[PDB]
Each structure stands twice: as C-alpha cells, then as structure tokens.
Amino acid sequence: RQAITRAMADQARTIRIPVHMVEVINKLGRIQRELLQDLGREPTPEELAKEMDITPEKVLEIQQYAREPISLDQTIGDEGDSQLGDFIE
Amino acid sequence: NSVPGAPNRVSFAKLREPLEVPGLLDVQTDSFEWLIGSPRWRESAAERGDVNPVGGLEEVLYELSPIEDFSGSMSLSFSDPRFDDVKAPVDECKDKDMTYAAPLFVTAEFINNNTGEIKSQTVFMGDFPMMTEKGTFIINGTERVVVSQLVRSPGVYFDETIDKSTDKTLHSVKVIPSRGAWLEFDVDKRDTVGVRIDRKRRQPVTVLLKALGWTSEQIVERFGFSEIMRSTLEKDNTVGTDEALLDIYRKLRPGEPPTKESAQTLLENLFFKEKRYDLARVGRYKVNKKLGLHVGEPITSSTLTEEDVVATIEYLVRLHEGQTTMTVPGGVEVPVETDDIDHFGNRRLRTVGELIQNQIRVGMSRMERVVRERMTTQDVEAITPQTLINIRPVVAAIKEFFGTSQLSQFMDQNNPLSGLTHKRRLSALGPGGLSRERAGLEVRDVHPSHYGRMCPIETPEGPNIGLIGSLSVYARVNPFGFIETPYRKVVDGVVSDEIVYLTADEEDRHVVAQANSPIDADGRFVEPRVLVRRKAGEVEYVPSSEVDYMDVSPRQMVSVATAMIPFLEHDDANRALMGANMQRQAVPLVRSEAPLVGTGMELRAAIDAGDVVVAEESGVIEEVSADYITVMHDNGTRRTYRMRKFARSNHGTCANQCPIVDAGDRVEAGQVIADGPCTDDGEMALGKNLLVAIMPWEGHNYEDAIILSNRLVEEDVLTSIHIEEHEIDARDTKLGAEEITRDIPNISDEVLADLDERGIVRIGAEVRDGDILVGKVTPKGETELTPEERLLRAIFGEKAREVRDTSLKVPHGESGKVIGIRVFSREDEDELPAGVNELVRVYVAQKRKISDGDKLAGRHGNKGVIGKILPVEDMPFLADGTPVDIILNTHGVPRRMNIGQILETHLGWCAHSGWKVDAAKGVPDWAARLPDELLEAQPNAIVSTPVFDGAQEAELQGLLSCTLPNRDGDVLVDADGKAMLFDGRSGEPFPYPVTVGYMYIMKLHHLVDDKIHARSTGPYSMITQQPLGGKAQFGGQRFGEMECWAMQAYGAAYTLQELLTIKSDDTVGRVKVYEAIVKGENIPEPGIPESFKVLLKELQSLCLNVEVLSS
Amino acid sequence: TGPGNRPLKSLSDLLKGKQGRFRQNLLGKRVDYSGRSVIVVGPQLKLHQ
Amino acid sequence: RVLRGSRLGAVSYETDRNHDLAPRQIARYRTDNGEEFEVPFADDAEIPGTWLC
Amino acid sequence: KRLKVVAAFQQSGNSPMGMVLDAVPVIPPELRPMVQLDGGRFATSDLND
Amino acid sequence: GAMLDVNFFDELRIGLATAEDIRQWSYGEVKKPETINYRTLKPEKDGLFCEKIFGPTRDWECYCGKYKRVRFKGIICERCGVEVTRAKVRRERMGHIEL
Ligand SMILES: [Zn+2]
C-alpha cells in the first residue's frame, strides 16, 4: 500500500507535486466532502482553515495547487469542428 | 373575445367555435407540477380517473425503495418527498446570479433485519430548481428553458424488408424496452428464425424455448401451424433445457466457465427481475394494448413475461404467414398488422417531467451504488442514513442537466413570441433520441398523424428540417406521454358538444369530418357527401352518417406563431415557413404599434406570453407610476406590481413595461395592466403599419431589395434599444493583485475624465469605440529594459512604472450611453469564483436607427435588406401628397407564390381608409355571408381575419369597391386596388395605376453592426500561427478550399501564394510585409509557412526520415 | 482515454481523420487583410466597381 | 467571451547582430563509447570536467 | 504480394533493421505546449500524458 | 539537402528512419517524467520542457540567469547548461528517449 500510494502521488498528475502536498490536498478534500455532508453546504475557506489549523491564504494556495490542467483536444462548440486551443489569444 | 381587457378587434369569423384556446404553457407547468406532486396536480389528475396519483419523485422513490444488502440482513427505505420554501425571490436571484431553487427533505428509513429498528431521519436531499410562472428556469442568473423531446415509445415494433435477391418478405421485430436489453426475433434468409439477443448474431427459437424451459412438445402445442417453426424445431440440434442454457451462457458470456444454474437465473434476471430491465408503465401499456394481454386490469409488473414472449413469436410467425387477426389464449384478438416508426401511437414525447425524472433516477443509481458499498464496509448497529446517504452525485446530476446539455437551452427571447416559441417546442434530437446525421430522411417528413398535433409548417429551414417542430394550438399531452387532441364528437349526424381528447391510435379507429362542414344550426350536416379523413390519411366523400368526430374549430393543425399570419391559405408552404420562422426574429421597437390586420391570436398569445403584467385580482387602481402600480383590491388588501424597465434580454433587446391605465380606472381579474416589449393595449405588435407600393423603382428594389422613406428615420418608426453588458474581474496573481484605480501608467488625463475616482465610468457618459470603461491595472514585475527605452526614460525623467495596464476597453463599433453599473466584491462578502477579488459589470446601451442593410420582412416570407433610404421628397407619392413609406418589388411576388401579402395590402388600405357599404337596397349580394357590424368601419380600425376562415375574394373586392374618402372627396384607390402615383423625382405621373396600401412589416435581428467585420492585423492563434477568428475578436475570414480552386482556375498563382503564406503563417513574413508597407517598399518574398514546418516536425517525430532535396 | 472516457489524441491522430493535418491544411486558412458584410444593390455604379 | 493565455517565456526584440558577439571557447567532451562532443563555453567560464552530453 | 514489399526493401537503400525501434524521438514542446490561462488553469496538449 | 529551407526546393523524399538518425536528430535525452514546477512555474531538468535540452523560453536569457544579452549568443553557461539563443528553436528542436 505504501508503494501504491507513492505511485499515486508521483505518476498520477501531469504536473508533479511532492508527496506531502499531495497528502495535505487529499486531507483537505476529505474534510471538504465530510463538511459538505455534515454542514449541508459547501464550506467557507475560513471554516476549513479553522478545521485544519492553517491560514485561509494557505487554504487558497492549496486550492490553487489542487487545480488539475485541462486538455486542448475537446470541442467547445456542441457542433464539434473547432478545438479548444483555436480560441487562445 | 370574452377577455375583459380586450380591445374591440373585429373579426371575419363565419364559424363559431365552441372550444377556446387553452393555457398554452400547460405543457411546461402541468408536467412540472406532476413531477412535484402539487395538490393542484393531485386533484387535477384525479379528476380524470387515476385512483392512484403518483408524483415523479414518488415514483422514483417507490421504484427504488427498498435498498438491501447482499445478505438480506438489513434494509433502507425512503418515504415522504416534501419541499421547503424557495431560498430567494425571483428578481433577487436574477440580479445576484443565484439560481432559483428550493430544498428537498426526504424521510429515509433504515431497518436492520437482524434485530429490528427503524431509522427515520429527515434527509436534506439537496437544492432543487423550480419552474417559474413564465414556465422557465433560472440557472446562475441566466434564464433557461427545457425543450420537450420526442423519442419512440418502448414496446414491440414490427416490419418486413423483402430481399429482392430472395423475393421473400423478411418479417422482423424489435422488442425495445426502456433502460433494458435488446432482443429481436427475425426470419432468416433461409426458412429459419432470427432470435438474436443483444446482438449475439445467431439464434433459433428452440434454444430460447428450451432456455425458457419448454419441451419440444410444449413448443408443439402452441406452435402447430407453420412449417417455419417445424423447420426450426428440426433444426434444433440440442434437446434438453440445460444444454440450451449452457449454449446461451457460452454465446452470452464467452470467456467464462459455465454453470447451469446461474444461466437460468441470469436470463431470469436479465428479462424478469425488474431492477436491471425496466420498460416503463407506458411501455407495458403499449405492449399489453398491442397484444391484448391485460385488457381488464391496470398496469403493474414492468418487466416482461414468457407469455408475452411466446405471444410475440406467434404474432411474428403469423405476420410472416399472412393473417388478419389472432387471439392469444386469455387475450382479446388484435389485428395482424405491422408497425410504423413515424405514427404518433409509437412516438411518445418525453416532457420536462420525464427528463428531470430520468436524471434523478440515474443520479439515485450512483447514490444507491454508494449505499450498497458502505452497507457492508461500515460497522453494524452504529450507522445511520445520515452516514449512508451521499447526495453529491444526485445534485451533480441535476446541475449537469440544467447546464451543459442539449435540451437545456437559453430562453430565446428577443420578443415574447420567440419566448412562447422556444417554449412549446418539439425536438427529435438529443440524448436518448436519434442524432442529426445518423437519422435518415423519412423521419424528417410529415406523417398524417401529425395533423392537429405537430404543426406541419413551423420548423427551422437550416440543417434541422423536420427534426424541430412545435405543438399545435389545441394539442395536449397524454399522461402516457402521447399527444392528445380535442374533437367535437358527432352522433347520428348531429354534432354534439362532448369534447373528446383523442390520441393518434384511437384517431385511426374512427373517421373524422372537418370544420368547414355546413351545419343546420342543430348539429346536422346538410351535405349527404362530406369530406372525411381515413386512418391511413385517405380522404373520401363519406355518406353522411358514419362520421363520429368533427374538428373543434379550423386551424387545429397549425402552431401559435404560424396562426398569426393572415391569408395563410393563399400562400405556398415554403414562403409561409420562411415568414413564420422570421416572425420569431422581430425586434422590439420603442413604440410597439398594433397591426391593423391580424388573427384572433394576438391577444391570447400575448397574455400567455409572460412578459405582460396582468391584473391578477379584480379591483380598482390606487396609484400608478412608471415603475409600479398600487392596485386597490375590492376587499381590503393592496398590491404593487413592480415594472421591469430597460431590462436587458438574452440578446441585447430591451424589456420595457409601461403601464396603460389611469388612477381612477377599475380593472378585473385576467386583464392586461401593463404592455410589454412587443405589445400594444394587450395584444401583440411585432412591427408597424406602412404605406407601401408594389412598383419596381430604379433598380433599387432589385431582387428582394427594399427601399424606405426617410420619414422612418425622422419619426423613429423603426428604432430599437440595444443593451450590451460588458464584464471584467479583479483577480489574484503571483505578482500581487489586480487593482482597479485611476493610476493607469502612460496615458493622458483627458481620456480619464469620464471615469470616477477608482476607474469605472459614471452613469450617462457617452462612450465611443475603444475608450476606457473600467480603469484597471495589473502588476507585471521586472524584465530588462531595452537600452533605447532606458535612454528615453533617462531623458524624460520618467520611472519604469512596473505595473501593466489591461483596462476594460469597449470593443469596436459599439457606443452609446452607459446605464447601470453592477459591481461585486470579495471583500464585501459577495460570492465570487476562486481567485477573483472584484467583479464589475457595465450595462452599455445604444439606440440604433434604421439603416441601409438592415433586414426587414413582412409576415409572408417577403424578406430583404434595405437597398436605399431615400429622402422624403424623391418618392412616388400619392395624389394627396402622402408619400409611400416602403416600396417592394413586383417580380419577386408571382414566382414565390405568396400573394397573401397582396391580399394583406388591399385589406390594409381598406382598413386604413374605413368604409361603409350601402344598405339602401339592403345587403349587396357579395356581402351576404359577411356578418354584421362590418358593413361600416371607422378609419384606422383594427380588424382580424381568422386563419382558414377569412375574407373571400368576393368580400375583399366588394369591400374594396366601397372605401369612403379621407378629407376631401378623394377616392384615392379604385375598385381594382391600384392608384395613380406621381414621381417625386421626375415629376410626371406614372402612365399606369399602381397597387398601394398598408402592409404590416417587421424589423429583424440581423442588423449590420451585428454582422460587419474587418481586420488588418489582430490576434493570432496559439497552437498554430493562424489569425484568430470570430467577431468577438477582430477575427479573420476563412479562405477555404473552393476559393483555392477558383484562384487556381484563374491561374493567379502569386496572389494565391500571398493569401496562403504572408497573411496566414509566415511569422517572419508578416512583420516584414507590414514594415515594407509602412516604408512604402516592395513586398518581400513569401517564406515557408508554419503549417508545413509543423507537418515536417510531426513526420520527423513519427520515426520517418523526411528528406528535402534540390538535386 | 482520459477524463470521462474521451479517447486521447495520439501522434498519428494529428494527421488522420477530420482534424488531420493534411485535410485541415487543405480546408483553408483564415487570413489577415480581409473582412465581410451584408450586401446591397448598387444600381448606379459602373461594372468595374 | 474572449479568452487568452501565455506561454511562460520572454519575447525580446533586438537585432540579429552577426558581427559583434561575446567571444567564446570550445571544449571537447568525450563520453564512454567513443563519442566526441564539443560544447561552446564562454571565455570567462570555468570548464567543468564532467558533463551530461 | 510478398515480393512487392521484399523487392521494395531490396531496391532502395533502406534496411528492415529500422522497422523495430530502439530510440523514440520527442516532438518539440511548442507543438504540444502547456499554456496557462488566466488563473493558472493549465492547458496541456494530451500528448504529454 | 537543406534543412534551413531557403527556397530552392525540387524534391521531397520520405524515408524510414534509423535509430542512428534518431539520436543524430536529438539534442539530448529526456529521462524524467516531469513538465514544470507547480510552484515557481519553471520547466524542470530532464523533463518534457527541459531548457537544457529543448531550449530557452526567454529570448537570449539562460536558465540560471548569468547571461541575459544577445551579445552573449552561441555560448552555453556552465551552471544552467543552456545554449543562449532566440526562443523559437523550441519550435524545431527534438528530443529522444533511449529505451
Ligand atoms: Zn542559465
């Protein structure tokens, strides 16, 4: 299980993130889902910073680090003829 | 008629219809409250039988409950779907961009079988959107409309395609369920059977019946009468049940060890266990009515049965045998007949309740999977349905459906007719249904079952013809998802008044006469031979006794928007289609004047349009404003009605709501109290009434081009207010934060005059193209300076000013006033997306005049751009000095077969002038069928022709004969309908009389500024080095393939090289060409384009040594 | 595939099919120094105008 | 509606001066399996012995 | 049908040794770029996976 | 035979590539499955955007930042290991993977 979690930390993201940041992201997401169930709404970052005992700007930096990239090989149009990358100035 | 605020519009109605037009948004509202389980629905469906009314949510909960562990040792149940109140009002949602919704509370109940408890929590299931009283949904502030979707109903479908190489009819069957598995019982090319299941390519009946568990003798005693089945029974090659089961398991699961017991149960699970195979209640009703199985008992047990399977096979072998009818044992005999995939008995309509129900069912599927998961992994006697239920896939499913879907579209509202047209819309494309390109030609056509149900006129004329129609006026949706249709039933020749909602199959049971049937005012027909419609679309002259149904009115076939065209019966369907399709594309004028000539639909359609404030409760006016009317009810209470003034619609058009009553007025319930965008005095108004002539003038009205008078510019007769909303956000970054302020490095102070202390402009500031709206600057950081810039900053004493300015500049060709500023802030606790600090939106508005190039059209398909706006003097003007307003073309009229515009022109001059026929010798013979209070008419009086009961040739011409003069004794227009015009340019009279009159025309949303587009040097792409395209940018023009063909065909090789290289992809070439132009030098040699080098690098990347050689 | 079972664009997928490099190059290129508008009749003008 | 991005790389604009450059050295690096690589270093630069060629 | 491809390898200066592959090339990265958007939303080109 | 493609084209010969030619084309071996740092947003060494291999992203600026002028051109700084040049050779330069 250690080696498989090592692999899921290393080779599962296109931008490589070190393992401690991956684990605190996973902890943040687990706490976010659990407080979504219990609180009934999506939590505020100040509440999550209260929960994981860090600062809200640290929460925002973790949220910035948690965003996975997107592909340029889907069509924005419902009629599919133009790639998404055909609109980038 | 019979609406208390209706203005006196006079009709030509010869026939008095009993049925009135229903509440046209019932197709949305009743479906949605069916899904809710409103008490309104609860009583209403119970008023037509329906001993057990079940809501859609109630149906999903009952078909899901109970949930069970694999052991059978504990169970979960749901109960009591109840709604809360909404979380915000409508206008507050629409302003603050919150979606309009209401929470769900569901009483769950967990039971341990091992010890025995109930666990009754009240589960917050999640937010749930609500249909507004306009029949729409508001999502994230945007306003969306769910489109109704046609699919084929689940059931048993029958056909044959005879093989021309074989000359044998090949009868086939697709037993299609909902959410199930395929099975088809064909007849092969040989004398065998095609019992292929879920595409497993090859099966006889014997493997299925011994797989069912019949003996050969049990096959014999039912199937006794065909050499077909006897040949297949001698092609059995496997006798014994378990051998057939393992053969099925082999052919179904290959790559799997066989077991004989699970093979019988998996087959029992795949077709009879109703948790993985669920043809609906409608599918069960369709099959049971098709084979006469449950003729005396209501619908349950939504899976199949072996009785139904053997009845299917027997019907198949008799239909491949040739029979007329057959009774199954225990069943009423059904006629041996095949099936259509286009008749409306087979093609149901998934409404919005069906769609939301399916989305909630597929969300609860994943939620149920999670419940099955943590039923075992969690501990026992410590869990609770709070711990069990995760609501996230369900609420994600709902949010995914209301967004990002084929069926969830924007409310297409440039005018309330297009609102009422995007509602009540039928689509055959989407998820579940057929796609566009895979679908053939036959479903695009019009079966005769469309009559009275789906309008055979109104459809888009693009690459969607036939796929998207609308409802008829009087159509209504069956609780089984079919399209029912009213009929006046006629008994013994006497027409009764029992209105009977008939659907498509029971239409074919009977035979139906028409609205233009002569009645003796006591029901009875006077013709012994009457027009009638037979089941296959046949028309006969019936002996006048067998008819059991008559139409409720005329125009029962037609849509709403198409029923707003006078003289429809004179126009061909092509230009009528074009006119009805453009009639949803009118724009709101600043005046909105009612037409002189119309139908009886303009009042009822506008009060059902939503965008007319209707007096809800009868009372008296207390105090008015331009923004609200305080009504004084007749018992106590008072009520305001907040007018929406200058609201932006979804396409830039305005949404003013002016009141139309005074302070002392007394109003009643159901009365119009405030006109909307395209309304006047209650009824519809999509344009203006203009004096028109039909001469060809100077080649300016060449081939549907239209000229105008300058008076339309002078009096603002065609003038719309366009409102455009711009947007910019303050966003976090690594280098700091985006800042909205006046400090905007490098720039004059004069261009910073209109903005406030913090960068945004103030209300009322006229902007041009390319000005500053939101003064906003971003941090950039430090790079090296070029030494020339270093010298210049050394000379001028300027700092670096390290921050970089990206202010919100207004784009090209857009100007006008600035009405309103809505601004959101993260620090002010507003909700914002992530990393965003301040979101400001600016309402920009302008008042566009009419202009040469604008697209105008009448109500008949006669469309066209504006050729030339002539001045007011150079105009063919009438003998009184009145100029004509617009001038159409003659040559476009006869070849387009649309003379309804000519009849509208004659009728419009008749209505403008006003008439009073002579009754000195009584009624003249032409005006006999013409009803009373029509013998006179005041000038500029509103009239109405109903669609298929309108003015005849005798009535129109005879009324045109007597057309009393205006101010002096001036009979301007003769009996023929023409008049003598004078040339405003030359001065001589025209040698021939010219057809004149008043036609009601429209202004369309295909304006010039919305289409003009040009670029010298703008933004490029990122991946390729091509110029970026689209009017949102500066944008380029696709020099396509046939263009390359044409310039090869001239042989202009150098210009082709120009266009392919140094305007597209020669990255080092573009700058040198721009430089050589500005220096005024020779245009240099075109280099190697980028798209070739990309291909070269990809071929080198694909392990292919591409070599380039000169010798 | 990737997210939501959409198959990944391979290297050979750049050249083949609808969005293939050959055909999309053969289809057309948007160009600079161009423009468009709706047209109206010009009945007084010369033929070479 | 318009969306833009940025390849994170600086685009400087000077002239391709072919004549006036900083003068430079060339160091011969050899790998294991008899392969020669010559790497252009600056004059004012210490030449490292080990190298990833 | 075999002599077609056999004489194809024979006549040219090719070698069937290159049919198997030992070193795989890599396309230049600007052809498959990872461009950021406004806010760090990255846009890969699906070859990088 | 001209890869710089100066306008005298006559033929276009497609040919199968040897592994010798493949390693002849490349300017380095990528050997780490990295793209870019999440934090500093600069490309990683031995990755799929490696400026040591593929080239500089900043016009005439090396990775370590020792040299930042166009007069410094056609040299390789000993620390960063990058050939300082114009930043469009990343359109042309290929890498390889020894398997
Ligand atoms: Zn460096």
Curated annotation (Swiss-Prot), chain A:
UniProt subcellular location: Cytoplasm
Region Sigma-70 factor domain-3, residue ranges: 23-89
Superkingdom, natural source: Bacteria
Family classification: Belongs to the sigma-70 factor family. RpoD/SigA subfamily.
Oligomeric form and interacting partners: Interacts transiently with the RNA polymerase catalytic core formed by RpoA, RpoB, RpoC and RpoZ (2 alpha, 1 beta, 1 beta' and 1 omega subunit) to form the RNA polymerase holoenzyme that can initiate transcription.
Function as written in the Swiss-Prot or TrEMBL entry: Sigma factors are initiation factors that promote the attachment of RNA polymerase to specific initiation sites and are then released. This sigma factor is the primary sigma factor during exponential growth.
Domain notes per entry: The sigma-70 factor domain-2 mediates sequence-specific interaction with the -10 element in promoter DNA, and plays an important role in melting the double-stranded DNA and the formation of the transcription bubble. The sigma-70 factor domain-2 mediates interaction with the RNA polymerase subunits RpoB and RpoC. The sigma-70 factor domain-4 contains a helix-turn-helix (H-T-H) motif that mediates interaction with the -35 element in promoter DNA. The domain also mediates interaction with the RNA polymerase subunit RpoA.
Name of the protein described by the UniProt record: RNA polymerase sigma factor SigA
Gene: sigA
Portion of the parent chain present: 352 to 440 of 528
From Swiss-Prot, chain C:
Highest taxon above the source species: Bacteria
Known role: DNA-dependent RNA polymerase catalyzes the transcription of DNA into RNA using the four ribonucleoside triphosphates as substrates.
Family: Belongs to the RNA polymerase beta' chain family.
Subunit structure: The RNAP catalytic core consists of 2 alpha, 1 beta, 1 beta' and 1 omega subunit. When a sigma factor is associated with the core the holoenzyme is formed, which can initiate transcription.
Protein name, UniProt field: DNA-directed RNA polymerase subunit beta'
Species whose genome carries this gene: Mycobacterium tuberculosis (strain ATCC 25177 / H37Ra)
Swiss-Prot record, chain D:
Source species, domain of life: Bacteria
Similarity section: Belongs to the RNA polymerase-binding protein RbpA family.
Subunit structure: Forms a complex with the RNAP catalytic core and with free principal sigma factors.
Function: Binds to RNA polymerase (RNAP), stimulating transcription from principal, but not alternative sigma factor promoters.
Name the record gives this protein: RNA polymerase-binding protein RbpA
Organism: Mycobacterium tuberculosis (strain CDC 1551 / Oshkosh)
Included range, full protein: 4 to 56 of 111
